[PDB]
Swiss-Prot record:
Its EC number is 5.4.99.20. One of its GO terms (biological process) is enzyme-directed rRNA pseudouridine synthesis. The keyword Isomerase applies. It catalyses: uridine(2457) in 23S rRNA = pseudouridine(2457) in 23S rRNA. This is Ribosomal large subunit pseudouridine synthase E. The keyword Cell inner membrane does not apply. Keywords: Isomerase, rRNA processing. GO terms for molecular function: 23S rRNA pseudouridine(2457) synthase activity; pseudouridine synthase activity; RNA binding; rRNA pseudouridine synthase activity. The lineage of its organism: Bacteria, Pseudomonadati, Pseudomonadota, Gammaproteobacteria, Enterobacterales. Responsible for synthesis of pseudouridine from uracil-2457 in 23S ribosomal RNA.
Length: 181
């Protein structure tokens, strides 16, 4: 039948997680000259980082089926310096307009050594920023951005480092690699 194709991509900012043309927007066609693969877990246009692309239904389901509790690790740049109480809330649960969140990982971290510049750069001189490592097991709309804002520390930049088995290890922004066996 259809030979399996699995590709990992480090998605740039302002690129859609798709191959289909979308008027006025940049897509994966500019980066990955492969047809027939699509996202196993879409990553927002204004997010960056790990995108898994495949043609295989089993893998798609494994990674995306609602309720599968697929783990995702994000590095998030936020305004201010989150308090211990705020981080505890992120770990335990907050209630968004669509309901409570599941328990999560949330830790204050150093700016990652592997970070690349964003073009354009983030959104101020007199206000510090911080980095969080957030580990989620759900995939609701703009979830990390909504959670951080909820507890008082809006997101400026969002990078998905890992999803399921996969990570960005050794993948520059805009680069892809094939996963084979």
């Amino acid at each position: 039948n259809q030979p399996t194709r699995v590709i990992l991509f480090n998605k740039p900012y302002d690129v859609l997680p798709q191959f289909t043309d979308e008027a006025g927007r940049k897509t994966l066609k500019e980066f990955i000259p492969v047809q027939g693969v699509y996202a196993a877990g879409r990553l927002d246009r204004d997010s960056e980082g790990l995108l898994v692309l495949t043609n295989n239904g089993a893998l798609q389901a494994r990674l995306t089926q609602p309720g599968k509790r697929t783990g995702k690790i994000y590095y998030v740049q936020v305004e201010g310096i989150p308090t211990q109480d705020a981080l505890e809330a992120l770990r335990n649960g907050v209630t968004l307009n669509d309901g409570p969140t599941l328990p999560a990982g949330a830790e204050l971290v150093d700016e990652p050594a592997w970070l690349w510049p964003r073009n354009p750069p983030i959104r101020r001189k007199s206000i510090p920023t911080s980095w969080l490592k957030i580990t989620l097991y759900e995939g609701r709309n703009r979830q990390v951005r909504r959670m951080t804002a909820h507890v008082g520390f809006p997101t400026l930049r969002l990078i998905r480092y890992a999803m399921g088995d996969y990570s960005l290890d050794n993948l520059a922004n805009g680069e892809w690699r094939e996963v084979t066996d």
